[PDB]
Structure 1
């Protein structure tokens, strides 16, 4: 079950960063993920291929020009056929987290609209956009990095692309001693069950110390409650 993602962007070449490299580049080459871009600049008709326009009411910056952007979106929708969810990325959208990613990854087709300048006309959001998503509470120069971020996150859910609420456990590889710091002996033990439990305990400890609010949203298993209690007692010596 592959995924098709239409992208509307003034800078489609930025998307080479995900389509030509690494796990996502492989997903594209192997036709697990298809990324197709439309550039509003190609839908302009004036001699200087104008893609921005002045905001009503005045203001510092420009907005994306409506007609080229609208026509690009319509073209992507026509290419997508039925059932594509159209998403605009901005700080005003639903904040993305891994539950949100798993929801988005249920769609076979997405169209991602990337804002530039100061953004896009509100009526295009009303008339063309199904959902608005943010990758986090910060401001960027464009929606392309947010679109790529979203693409990379959902691509991990496509079968073939790759080989629980808590932060990751610490990881160790060679050498056994690095600037005087040794690998925890349990990881050398070959005791699979002890190693599982140690990793889970470490994730519980690190989530508690760094992101305690994330624990509040979980229904811990008996085992997790036990390991967390242990980590907390060790922390309190």
Structure 2
């Protein structure tokens, strides 16, 4: 009955408590908006040492994940999905960088089977055969795909209806009015509810321009927001 079924293929399923016990994903799991199941490839091995790493063909340092244990856990995950259209995602640095655009696309799916790789990664033929899409969470290399898998689940979950632009946010201020010789901008303490809306929007635009100008090349600035940005750039030291 859940609006998104997620199956995670990982040798560390305990690690995923970070999303099952905490936050919006945890809430969604309880509310039944998200079914979160794990599939340890180690419980699909033929030896007592639960060996899941194989040597690489052509030498070189590192290990490759063993194909048969992965095959097992994937088949089992596919089985539990039922009649749901399940997209198989491999979390990989070589994948399509995840952006909110991709998150919206992934949120439209009814089932997601996420492969959390380890060591040097998973065999190319295994990808070629089973994987539907490859995603990266950013241009940095991590030790495994469990944290990227959890990041993907969290990002998509917020979009699931009931769980809860291209412009950075405005700065935020809370109690006290003055702290360590630093005072809250007057516009917030004494100002119109449309002039606070004005200032916040102007700060949003300005901070985006200052830090993430690329997000503004993508965006198409309106008349109203170009004037507030011009005001920001000119009213700045």
What is residue 112 of structure 1 aligned with on the other side?
114
13-22 or 182-191: bigger deviation: 182-191
What is residue 209 of structure 1 aligned with on the other side?
210
- The counterpart of 1:91, out of the listed 89, 93, 115, is 93
What is residue 160 of structure 1 aligned with on the other side?
162
2:3, 2:202 → 1: CA distance? 36
How many Å apart are 1:190 and its aligned residue?
Answer: 5.6
How many Å apart are 1:112 and its aligned residue?
Answer: 0.4
Pairing 1:140–2:155 present = no
Residue by residue over 1:180-200, the C-alpha shift from the partner in whole angstroms, topping out at 9 and shown as x without a partner, is 111112222362211111111
1:108, 1:180 → 2: CA distance? 53
54-63 or 26-35: bigger deviation: 26-35
What is residue 131 of structure 2 aligned with on the other side?
129
Q: Report matched runs for 1:9-20 at 5 Å.
A: 9-20=10-21
2:46, 2:10 → 1: CA distance? 17
> What are structure 1's unaligned runs of at least 5 residues?
none
Q: Report matched runs for 1:166-205 at 5 Å.
A: 166-189=167-190, 191-205=192-206
1:197, 1:102 → 2: CA distance? 29
Pairing 1:222–2:223 present = yes
Residue by residue over 1:206-229, the C-alpha shift from the partner in whole angstroms, topping out at 9 and shown as x without a partner, is 011111111111111221111111
Residue by residue over 1:85-138, the C-alpha shift from the partner in whole angstroms, topping out at 9 and shown as x without a partner, is 110011100001111211111112111000001100001110100000000000
What is residue 78 of structure 1 aligned with on the other side?
79
Pairing 1:4–2:30 present = no
SS in 1 for 2:194: helix
What is residue 36 of structure 2 aligned with on the other side?
35
What is residue 101 of structure 1 aligned with on the other side?
103
